[PDB]
Design a protein around this ligand. Structure first.
Ligand SMILES: [Mg+2]
Length: 354
């Protein structure tokens, strides 16, 4: 198999509601969609979701980078994922969004060539995944109301955003808690909003509220501070922005900074790297959750889903980007219907088409 050509296009999908987190807001899912054509005719799909306030990447920069990658890999075999990353890495010292887009399309081609759904090439542990659904920052009573709604849809886990201040945040959780019950799992994400000691205070405050875990409580660069938190509460602390790639993961397991790690294809540059992170985490006894950027769509979510189902140590999933999309940019793959169960089929690759 040989890559004949690489095409990339912009994608802009209106979100059904304006999403808001501690780092900023977003109202449109704008990403880079790639299509890699082989000499034999097979076409693999990939996506690059740039998150300016998470990674600093932009759609303009992502599109430019993807084009440089596309011209550099013509003639290579998609199965040579090792060289493909070698090639991209020599071109750019940092562009996870661009790299993930190429990476994902290559794995899609691999699956299509082997005539196997992608999850089978990635470990084959399962052929489906269960995802939570996130609740963007808002008013305590508003979030509590939306919670009941998602639960009504069939969701058992809810990701709750916080970060305006330990005060209002605490009020937010409790409100939602005594609104849906105690059978529902509740994970919290503060996107680096708290200081070490105020983090310990806020978490302990929700001691009797039964929180599953707290995602990135402090600044991504304050590793000593993050470990401080992890080591003060018995509650499960997860690292997100503090862990982009495998080298980040190695540093965290070494220092024993957190309990769980959030993996995002758009942070590590693709499945190839995601595989590395999960392996390092599993070996260290740290489970992983597979996340997503608000800007990515069907292709990125589908790729992430196949990886999550395939790998045993990826025990949690936060693949809800397609739930807020007004329309689908492609056919097949993970539906936009808000449902916790994402079942992957027997279609080869990502199972996606124009
Ligand atoms: Mg997070």
């Amino acid at each position: 198999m040989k890559i004949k050509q690489v095409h990339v296009r912009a994608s802009k999908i209106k979100l059904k509601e304006t999403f808001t987190i501690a780092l900023g807001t977003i109202e449109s899912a704008d990403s880079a969609i790639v299509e890699i054509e082989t000499e034999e005719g097979l076409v693999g799909y990939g996506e690059g979701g740039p998150g300016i306030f998470i990674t600093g990447e932009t759609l303009a920069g992502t599109l430019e980078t993807i084009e440089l990658f596309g011209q550099a890999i013509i003639g290579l075999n998609p199965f040579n994922i090792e060289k493909i990353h070698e090639v991209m890495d020599k071109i750019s010292a940092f562009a996870p969004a661009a790299k993930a887009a190429i990476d994902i399309a290559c794995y899609d081609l691999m699956g299509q060539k082997a005539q196997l759904p992608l999850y089978q090439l990635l470990g084959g542990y399962d052929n489906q995944v269960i995802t939570d659904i996130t609740l963007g920052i808002d008013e305590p009573n508003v979030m509590a109301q939306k919670a009941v709604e998602k639960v009504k849809l069939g969701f058992d886990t809810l990701k709750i955003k916080v970060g305006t201040g330990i005060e209002a945040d605490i009020a937010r959780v409790k409100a939602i808690r005594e609104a849906v019950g105690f059978d529902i799992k509740l994970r919290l994400d503060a996107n680096q909003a708290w200081t070490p000691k105020d983090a310990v205070k806020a978490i302990q405050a929700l001691a009797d509220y039964q929180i599953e875990l707290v995602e990135q409580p402090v600044k991504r660069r304050d590793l000593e501070g993050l470990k401080y938190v992890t080591s003060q509460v018995n509650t499960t602390i997860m690292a997100d922005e503090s862990c982009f790639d495998a080298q980040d993961a190695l540093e965290l397991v070494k220092k024993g900074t957190v309990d769980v790690i959030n993996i995002k294809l758009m942070k590590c540059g693709g499945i190839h790297e995601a595989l590395k992170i999960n392996q390092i985490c599993e070996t260290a006894g740290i489970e992983c959750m597979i996340g997503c950027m608000a800007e990515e769509t069907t292709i990125g979510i589908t790729a992430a889903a196949h990886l999550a189902a395939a790998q045993k140590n990826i025990t949690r999933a936060d693949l809800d980007a397609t739930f807020g999309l007004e329309t689908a940019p492609v056919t097949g793959g993970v539906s936009l219907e808000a449902k916790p169960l994402l079942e992957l089929g027997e279609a080869a690759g990502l199972g996606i088409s124009h």
